[PDB]
Amino acid sequence: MDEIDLRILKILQYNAKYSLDEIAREIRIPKSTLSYRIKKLEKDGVIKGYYAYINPASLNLDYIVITSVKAKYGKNYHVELGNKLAQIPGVWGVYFVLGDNDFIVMARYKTREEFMEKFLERVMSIPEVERASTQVVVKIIKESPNIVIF
Amino acid sequence: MDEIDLRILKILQYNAKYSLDEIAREIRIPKSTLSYRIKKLEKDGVIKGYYAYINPASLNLDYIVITSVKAKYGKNYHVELGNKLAQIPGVWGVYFVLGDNDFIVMARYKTREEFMEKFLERVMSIPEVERASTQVVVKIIKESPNIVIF
Amino acid sequence: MDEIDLRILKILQYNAKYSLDEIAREIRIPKSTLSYRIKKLEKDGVIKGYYAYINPASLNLDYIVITSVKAKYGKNYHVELGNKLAQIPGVWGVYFVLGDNDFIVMARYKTREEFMEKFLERVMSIPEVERASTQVVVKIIKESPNIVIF
Amino acid sequence: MDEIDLRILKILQYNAKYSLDEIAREIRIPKSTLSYRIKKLEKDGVIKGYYAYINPASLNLDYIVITSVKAKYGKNYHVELGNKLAQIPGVWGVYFVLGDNDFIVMARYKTREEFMEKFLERVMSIPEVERASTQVVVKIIKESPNIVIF
Amino acid sequence: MDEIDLRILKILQYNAKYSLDEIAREIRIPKSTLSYRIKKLEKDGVIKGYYAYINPASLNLDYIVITSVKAKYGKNYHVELGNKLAQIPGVWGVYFVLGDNDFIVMARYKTREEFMEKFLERVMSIPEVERASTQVVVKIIKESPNIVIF
Amino acid sequence: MDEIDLRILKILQYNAKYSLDEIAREIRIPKSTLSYRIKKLEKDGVIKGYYAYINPASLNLDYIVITSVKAKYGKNYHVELGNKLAQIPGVWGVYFVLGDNDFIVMARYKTREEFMEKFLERVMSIPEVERASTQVVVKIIKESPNIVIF
Amino acid sequence: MDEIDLRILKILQYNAKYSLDEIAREIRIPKSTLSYRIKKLEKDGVIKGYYAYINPASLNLDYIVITSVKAKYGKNYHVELGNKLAQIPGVWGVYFVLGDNDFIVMARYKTREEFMEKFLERVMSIPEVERASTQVVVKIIKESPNIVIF
Amino acid sequence: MDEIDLRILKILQYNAKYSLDEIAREIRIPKSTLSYRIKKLEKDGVIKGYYAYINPASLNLDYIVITSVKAKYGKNYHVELGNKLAQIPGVWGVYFVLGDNDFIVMARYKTREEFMEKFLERVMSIPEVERASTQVVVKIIKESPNIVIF
Ligand SMILES: NC(=O)CC[C@H](N)C(=O)O
Ligand SMILES: NC(=O)CC[C@H](N)C(=O)O
Ligand SMILES: NC(=O)CC[C@H](N)C(=O)O
Ligand SMILES: NC(=O)CC[C@H](N)C(=O)O
Ligand SMILES: NC(=O)CC[C@H](N)C(=O)O
Ligand SMILES: NC(=O)CC[C@H](N)C(=O)O
Ligand SMILES: NC(=O)CC[C@H](N)C(=O)O
Ligand SMILES: NC(=O)CC[C@H](N)C(=O)O
Ligand SMILES: [Mg+2]
Ligand SMILES: [Mg+2]
Ligand SMILES: [Mg+2]
Ligand SMILES: [Mg+2]
Ligand code: NA
Ligand code: NA
Ligand code: NA
Ligand code: NA
Ligand code: NA
Ligand code: NA
Ligand code: NA
Ligand code: NA
Ligand code: NA
Ligand code: NA
Ligand code: NA
Ligand code: NA
Ligand code: NA
Ligand code: NA
Ligand code: NA
Ligand code: NA
Ligand code: NA
Ligand code: NA
Ligand code: NA
Ligand code: NA
């Protein structure tokens, strides 16, 4: 990757539906090359794919939660718990972090009932779970994970 | 939105680079209509846009952090603090949550130094901040915010 | 339910011992209809019943407590613990809440001894209990659960 | 108050809509006396009033919260904060408790938006507030404050 | 007990080595009666005994600790743990309290080594102990348990 | 102090109302000497005094509390707060401890009302107080501060 | 040890590569004696050895951590856990402390990966571990353990 | 630095008082070269110096503490507090860490009194300090900061 690739990426991270001509015109390079570079980035694994950004509200996803989960120590409980949490429907993020040395789980549901049935009841039944604390998100100030180049 | 739109969205959320023919063939509808429905979803605000999914590692984003920030009470400190946190370079997520009644801030940096200079030093200088606790992410078990339809 | 029912309910929630004439005169409708509406609300389940509001002090209920109880994870411990807590004499409120992801238990006793014997000793013997923290209420600033329409 | 009054109260706390004949027949005393005793209890302040028990769901009160609020020390901040919390629409319970030496506030709202506008925004603007932690109630196992005699 | 007994007690709690004449002269009553009242208080259990107040420093008791101990729930673990803590040499106070719903243990030792061997090692070996937190006392602002009448 | 003084003290700490003959007979020394040693211990400050042990229940001291108080940093707030806490009627113990780096305050009152008026209201009005947490003692397993020699 | 030894030590703790002449000249004593005193201190165990102070950065030790580890109670779990933590490669400090009544573990690694593989995975597999909380060091303001004489 | 330098350093970190012949014989290289390499490491800053390892007990350093200090937010309070803590006599370690987002301070004193006068009183007077929590070290399982190569 070179400074040119970064300029290309800084555009595709925002709008992947731009025309090669408009892009090639903004970055100042042969539209034929731009196409090559983009294809190269895809193969090299820089660009993993293209996604449609769907508005969660449009899907009635009104019950947004961020849950900290502590796992019991020993055997391979920690790793096992992480993968179980990642396969729960509605869960889009699972991170293991230092400090609280636990898992931070991001999920979205349409309502409290759905959250209870699909997420909480499932989590409460996992023996390896030492403690879980769910924080209800009441305001999304910002959520642009797609922006990696500031 | 109808059951057909959901089927279309369940595809575009994963791969927006599919061909209309392959999509129209999977859902079983006139490629001409599919195109109309997709265009409608865009105008109605369901599909807000299309983004390229860039691998953070490819950008050397190795210092990933999740920080809880508590704001001092009174005046309009809470709302002000939220917007200040959202404009910090590297910060892609800001949520106000109940429980700890604070802000959960998601950010990514290439190194500790960059994190300190761009994020921490900035946060430590904000007077409205009562307390901040940063959790270093050492393992991303899952991060697929694009998946809204399970 | 219509705006008229709400006006009726806003009265019955405060004083269910009012005369139909005084009520019918305040809301401005045929006393015969008012009676019908009230009867309808009862059948439809809006009005579940009528209770006498007894002053706790009159019963020497001087030891008022609010206890947070955390349940151990696994099997069906959480649900089981909730129902056990609800059947303890003196306990009038049991809620499962997010944040501390535990149970908040409201109870009233005449003295510390009664609290110990009927509530605490019972709770300390429940194996599914991970931790319990009792907060002694020393001042009831307000307690009007009957007011649902402000 | 005597053992007879307690038997009367144990009935009125459950159903104040019983007939004097049915009550007088259950307790075994002159319906004329029962009426006197009940009237006496009202004047002596034992029976403060009669209320209609309205089902919160019937009013779409789906966002139920229990919030702990800590007040800053000094002057008369504590007492002032307590009364401010009690006058917030939707708040039916306010207790000052030992342990966390703070206020436990019970409130009900129809939705998150209403909760934010009427309760949280109001609380976040109170300078005397040191910290507030809201626990979202996701399950009401039991809520019978009217039962004072077990 | 009458106002006269309280005046007598308010003296004996401070200095039990006073002369009956000086006491009888301060309270204004027949030295013969004073003696009777004091004897009565002893039998009735008001005055449980007379102790010599020894200066802890004189005994090289330099390692003073206050430890909170949480017991595991179930069976009769709580009560058992309390009595075990009370029989540890050096422990003069054991209280079960609400809030942290645990035991507060007061002890005194000459040094850290003695504290470790006699108190901590013993406590760490008790299975019923869920958690223990020792606070080292570095300054005794006041310690007059003998004063019960202010 | 020698081994003989310790034997004398081990007796006086339990019962200072023993007869010199019984003591001299138990320790095996001239009653005349025993008297000298005891007098020496008093002057040297080992024995600070003799107190009557009064049963708190006999004084209706039913509301027993242990409160942790955190002081604000700066100036001489810490030292000042300590002395203010020690002069509150009902407070018999005040210790500054490490760990929570705060004050542990022991007090006794006859009732909740008295506790509120004499202790809590006073503490809540002290500006230097950052936070206070009161633990209600519901069971005194052991309280023998007089025993310094085990 | 005398005041002269302290002066010698105050030098050797900073720079053990000084010449006997320069040292003997600064302290004002026969270089032959200085040599004797130093040899005596070594045998008496005051000076345990001489070490080269290596700059951690020079070894790419960029992931510095301080971890609190709580051990389960009973048997000899506490002591066993302490020694296991001390034998983990990268761990240079292990202390058992009061307050949190746990272990504080100091370690250094070149990267997050190394930290995970050598330290965290190892710690997460220890059954005796109740909880562990790792604090990532982002700035070493001072680290001069060699200075014992200020 | 090469594999040879590491072998040299792995020796000097343990015993810098070895003879060049013994070292040159263990690593298998010209004693003349070894000397050059060591001199190079010193200039390049790898070896910052040589220190005498003094046994803290030999200096009566019996009161060992690890203190967490939280700084108030705003201005440049954080950085200022860090340097103030580093200049306190007895303090050998100061680290700013993530998680608790505060300072971890390592210090050693001969007694509690010295700790109070030199460390605690000083820290309690710093206005920028929000909270400080001192953990008394009662057992040093391991303290070998000099070992950087395992
Ligand atoms: N479109 C451009 O910017 C240049 C055109 C380029 N030569 C091509 O092959 O398309
Ligand atoms: N491609 C299809 O699935 C149908 C073709 C459609 N009639 C069109 O207008 O393209
Ligand atoms: N009481 C009223 O307000 C109107 C009387 C009504 N017509 C009835 O049937 O009783
Ligand atoms: N109803 C009863 O139980 C007795 C009647 C009673 N004598 C009256 O005055 O009504
Ligand atoms: N000593 C007094 O105060 C009065 C004496 C009292 N009459 C007695 O019997 O000793
Ligand atoms: N009472 C004793 O034990 C010995 C008596 C002692 N000789 C005295 O002077 O009293
Ligand atoms: N070097 C000195 O300071 C004095 C020399 C000393 N007489 C010796 O034996 O070396
Ligand atoms: N001492 C050795 O290992 C080799 C000696 C080396 N030739 C020197 O110059 O000292
Ligand atoms: Mg996307
Ligand atoms: Mg009622
Ligand atoms: Mg005494
Ligand atoms: Mg060294
Ligand atoms: Na969190
Ligand atoms: Na993991
Ligand atoms: Na939302
Ligand atoms: Na907000
Ligand atoms: Na990562
Ligand atoms: Na609570
Ligand atoms: Na439940
Ligand atoms: Na009350
Ligand atoms: Na109050
Ligand atoms: Na509900
Ligand atoms: Na405590
Ligand atoms: Na008990
Ligand atoms: Na002391
Ligand atoms: Na002090
Ligand atoms: Na008691
Ligand atoms: Na710590
Ligand atoms: Na140990
Ligand atoms: Na560093
Ligand atoms: Na800093
Ligand atoms: Na030590």
- State the DSSP string of chain F: --HHHHHHHHHHTT-TT--HHHHHHHHTS-HHHHHHHHHHHHHTTSEEEEEEEE-GGGGT--EEEEEEEEEPPSTTHHHHHHHHHHTSTTEEEEEEETTTTEEEEEEEESSHHHIIIIIIHHHHT-TTEEEEEEEEEEEEEEE-TT----
Burial class (CB in 10 A: 0-12, 13-18, 19+), A83: exposed
Check if C116 contacts F (Cβ < 8 Å): yes
CA B14/CA A148 separation, integer angstroms: 19
Question: Whole-angstrom Cα distance, residue F112 to residue F63?
Answer: 6
- Per the DSSP assignment, residues forming a β-bridge with C137 are C64, D97
Q: How many CB pairs under 8 A join B and D?
A: 32
Dist CA B74 CA B114 (whole Å): 32
* Burial class (CB within 10 angstroms; exposed 0-12, middle 13-18, buried 19+) of E4: middle
Asked if C132 and C69 count as a contact pair (C-beta separation under 8 A), the reply is yes
Q: Is G87 helix (H, G, I), strand (E, B) or coil?
A: coil
Distance between B132 CA and the closest CA of chain G, angstroms: 14
**Does residue B30's CB lie within 6 angstroms of at least one atom of ligand 2?**
yes
| Residue A58 near residue B8, CB atoms below 8 Å | no
Q: Identity (one letter) of the amino acid at C46? A: V
CB within 8 Å of A77: residues ≥ 6 apart = A71, A128, G124
The number of C-alpha atoms within 13 Å of F101 and in the hemisphere containing its C-beta is 25
Give bridge partners of residue H51 from the DSSP assignment: G51
Q: What angle do CA D79, D81, D83 make, to 5 degrees?
A: 75
CA distance A79 to A96: 10
Q: Is C12 helix (H, G, I), strand (E, B) or coil?
A: helix
Q: What residue has token string 């151990």?
A: C72
Tokens 């100042």 appear where? Answer: A28
Torsions phi, psi for G23 (to 5 deg): -70, -50
Q: Is B78 in the pocket of ligand 2 (CB under 6 A)?
A: no
Residues in a beta bridge with F133: F68
Bridge partner residues of B96 (DSSP): A139, B103
Nearest to A59 by CA among B26, D136, B45: B45
d(CA D150, CA D142): 14
Whether H56 has its CB under 8 Å from any CB of chain G: the answer is yes
Task: Output the CA C42–ligand 3 centroid distance in Å.
Answer: 20
Q: Cβ distance D99 to B67 under 8 Å?
A: no
Say if residues C89 and D150 touch (Cβ distance below 8 Å): yes
- Distance between first and last Cα of chain G: 17
Q: What one-letter code names the amino acid at C54?
A: I
Three-state SS at E138: strand
Which residue, D71, F81, G79, E9, is CA-closest to B74? D71
Alpha-carbon distance of H140 to E48, in angstroms, equals 46
Q: At a CB cut-off of 8 Å and minimum separation 6, what does E10 contact?
A: E149
Count CA atoms within 13 Å of residue D110 on its CB side. Answer: 6
Q: Are C58 and C44 in contact (CB under 8 A)?
A: no
Q: CB D73: neighbour CB atoms within 10 A?
A: 23
Longest Cα separation, chain F = 59
DSSP codes, G11-63: HHTT-TT--HHHHHHHHTS-HHHHHHHHHHHHHTTSEEEEEEEE-GGGGT--E
Q: Hey, CA dihedral for E84, E88, E92, E98, is it positive or negative?
A: negative
CA neighbor of F105 nearest in space, from F138, F80, F81: F81
Residues 6+ positions from F141 with CB-CB distance below 8 Å: E82, E83, E85, E86, E94, E95, E96, E103
Among D86, D99, D103, D15, CA closest to D53: D15
How far apart, in Å, are the Cα atoms of E145 and each of A71, E99, E134, E149, F105? 45, 23, 21, 10, 12
From the CB coordinates, do chains F and E have 3 or more pairs under 8 Å?
yes
Q: In 3-state terms, what secondary structure has residue B13?
A: coil
Whether E31 and E24 have beta carbons less than 8 Å apart is answered as yes
Q: Which residue of G has its CA nearest to F102?
A: G99
Question: Shortest CA distance to A103 belongs to which of A118, A115, A85?
Answer: A85
CA A10 to chain centre: 18
On whether the CB atoms of residues E2 and E37 are closer than 8 A, the answer is no
Facing residues of D29 across strands?
A: none
Residue C118, phi-psi category: left (phi > 0), alpha (psi -120 to 50), beta (remainder): alpha
d(CA F55, CA G121): 56
Tokens of D36: 């006197």
Burial classification of residue H30, based on how many CB atoms lie within 10 Å of its CB (0-12 exposed, 13-18 middle, 19 or more buried): exposed
Token pair of C110 as six digits: 């005449």
Taking the C-alpha atoms of residue H127 and residue E130, their distance in angstroms, rounded to an integer, is 37
Let me know: does B11 contact B146? Beta carbons within 8 Å: no
Q: What is the DSSP letter of B98?
A: T
Give strand pairing partners of G136: G65
Output the CA–CA distances (angstroms, integers) from residue H147 to G32, G89, G95, H11, in the order listed. 33, 10, 17, 10
- Which residue stretches of B71-147 are H helix? 77-86, 112-114, 121-124
Rg of chain C taking only CA atoms, in angstroms? 20
Alpha-carbon span A50 to C58, nearest angstrom = 70
- In C43-125, at which residue ranges do the beta strands (DSSP E only) sit? 47-54, 63-71, 91-97, 102-109
- Asked if G129 and A100 come within 8 Å (Cβ–Cβ), the reply is no
Secondary structure percentages of chain E, helix, strand, coil, to 5: 40, 30, 30
Place of tokens 């820290």: H123
CA distances from A37 to A1, A22, F31 (A): 9, 16, 106
Domain locations in chain A as residue ranges: 1-52, 53-150
- CA A142/CA A144 separation, integer angstroms: 6
**How many angstroms separate the alpha carbon of residue E55 from the centre of ligand 23?**
25
Side-chain-side CA neighbours of residue G137 (13 Å): 26
Q: Could you give the 3-state DSSP secondary structure of residue B73? A: coil
Residue with tokens 């989960």: A69
Token look-up 């509001």 returns: C53
Is B11 strand, coil or helix? helix
CB H135 within 8 A of CB H67: yes
CA distance H26 to G129: 41
Residues H96-106 as b/e (b if ≥16 CB within 10 A, e otherwise) read bbbbbbbbbbb
Helix H or strand E encompassing C25: helix C20-27
- Tokens (6 digits) for A50: 């293209």
A90 close to B150: Cβ distance less than 8 angstroms? yes
Residues in chain G after which the backbone breaks (C–N beyond 2.5 Å): none
G127 touches chain A (CB under 8 A): yes
Question: Residue D41's Cα: distance from chain center in Å?
Answer: 20
Question: Rounded to an integer, what distance in angstroms lies between the CA atom of residue C126 and that of residue E75?
Answer: 8
Query: Tokens representing G75?
Result: 């048997």
Architecture of domain D1-52: Orthogonal Bundle (1.10)
Residue from H112, H115, H119, H137 whose CB has the most chain E CBs within 10 Å, to mutate: H112
Q: Cα angle vertex G140, ends G134, G143, to 5°? A: 105
Nearest to E131 by CA among E78, E50, E70, E74: E70
Q: Which residues contact A111 (CB under 8 A, 6 or more apart)?
A: A60, A62, A63
Classify A2 as helix, strand or coil: coil
Is the CB of residue B100 less than 8 Å away from at least one CB of chain C? Answer: yes
Q: Amino acid identity, residue F67?
A: T
- Size (chain B), residues: 150
Q: Which residues of C32-71 are buried (b: 16+ CB within 10 A; e: fewer)?
A: eebeebbeebeeeebbebbbbbbeeebbebbbbbbbbbbb
Resolution in A for the shown PDB structure?
1.9
Max CA pair span of chain E? 59
| Residue E12: Cβ-neighbour burial (10 angstroms; 0-12, 13-18, 19+) | buried
Domain with residues B53-150, CATH architecture: 2-Layer Sandwich (3.30)
Please tell me the distance in Å from E99's CA to the nearest CA on chain D: 4
Q: SS3 of A139, please?
A: strand
Q: What is the DSSP letter of A115?
A: I
By C-alpha distance, the chain G residue nearest H66 is: G97
Amino acid at D82: G
- Tell me the CA–centroid distance for residue E31 and ligand 5, in Å: 4
CB neighbours (10 Å) of residue D135? 26
Q: Computed from CA positions of residues A21, A25, A27, A30, in that sequence, does the dihedral angle turn out positive or negative?
A: positive
Please report, as a single letter, which amino acid is at residue F142: K
Of A18, E69, A143, D116, nearest to B50 by C-alpha is A18
Q: Ligand 3 atom 8: the closest Cα is on which residue?
A: C32
Dist CA G105 CA G91 (whole Å): 7
Q: Which two structure tokens, joined as six digits, stand for G115? A: 């930290």
Nearest by Cα to D65 from D124, D107, D120: D107
How many angstroms is it from A79 CA to the middle of ligand 17? 15
User: Partners of F50 in the beta sheet?
Assistant: E52
Placement of tokens 């939705």 in the chain: D111
Q: Which residues contact B107 (CB under 8 A, 6 or more apart)?
A: B64, B65, B67, B88, B90, B91, B92, B93, B115, B119
Tell me how far apart the alpha carbons of residues G49 and G16 are, in angstroms, rounded to a whole number. 10
Query: Nearest-CA neighbor of D140 among D79, D57, D59, D76?
Result: D57
Helices D3-12/D31-43 angle, 10° precision: 80
Beta bridge pairs of residue G71: G129
| First-residue to last-residue Cα distance in chain D | 17
Å from H36 to nearest chain G CA? Answer: 16
Using CA atoms, how far residue A109 sits from A137, B11, B149, D104, in Å, is 11, 19, 10, 28
Q: What letter does residue H117 receive in the DSSP assignment? A: I
Side chain identity at C114, as an amino acid letter?
Answer: E
Angle, alpha carbons C21-C22-C23 (nearest 5°): 90
d(CA D28, CA D11): 13
Q: Please report, to the nearest 10 degrees, the dihedral formed by the alpha carbons of residues H3, H9, H11, H17 taken in order.
A: 140
Coil/strand/helix, residue H120: helix
Angle at D20 between CA D18 and CA D26, to 5 degrees: 85
Q: Which two tokens stand for residue E96?
A: 């079960």
Within chain D, residue ranges assigned H as helices are 3-12, 20-27, 31-43, 77-86, 112-114, 121-124
* Of F103, H81, D129, H97, the residue nearest B130 (C-alpha): D129
Q: Residues lining ligand 7, judged by CB closer than 6 Å?
A: G 21, 24, 30-32
Alpha-carbon torsion angle C69, C75, C76, C80, nearest 10 = -60
If phi > 0 it is left, if psi is from -120 to 50 it is alpha, else beta; for residue D28 that is left
CA–CA distance, C86 with C106 (Å, rounded to integer): 10
Three-class secondary structure of residue D33 per DSSP: helix
Q: Under 8 Å CB-to-CB from F66, ≥6 apart: which residues?
A: E95, E97, E104, F104, F105, F106, F134, F135, F137
Nearest to G134 by CA among G82, G57, G64, G56: G64
The amino acid present at A82, given as its one-letter code, is G
By CB atoms closer than 10 A (0-12, 13-18, 19+), residue D76 is exposed
Structural tokens at position B81: 């603090």
Q: Which residues make Cβ contacts (< 8 Å) with residue E3, sequence separation at least 6?
A: none
Those chains having 3 or more beta-carbon pairs within 8 angstroms of chain D are A, B, C, E, F
- Whether C21 is in the pocket of ligand 3, judged by its Cβ within 6 Å, is yes
Task: Tell me the C-alpha distance between D72 and A120, whole Å.
Answer: 35
- Nearest 5°: the CA angle C93, C95, C98 is 155
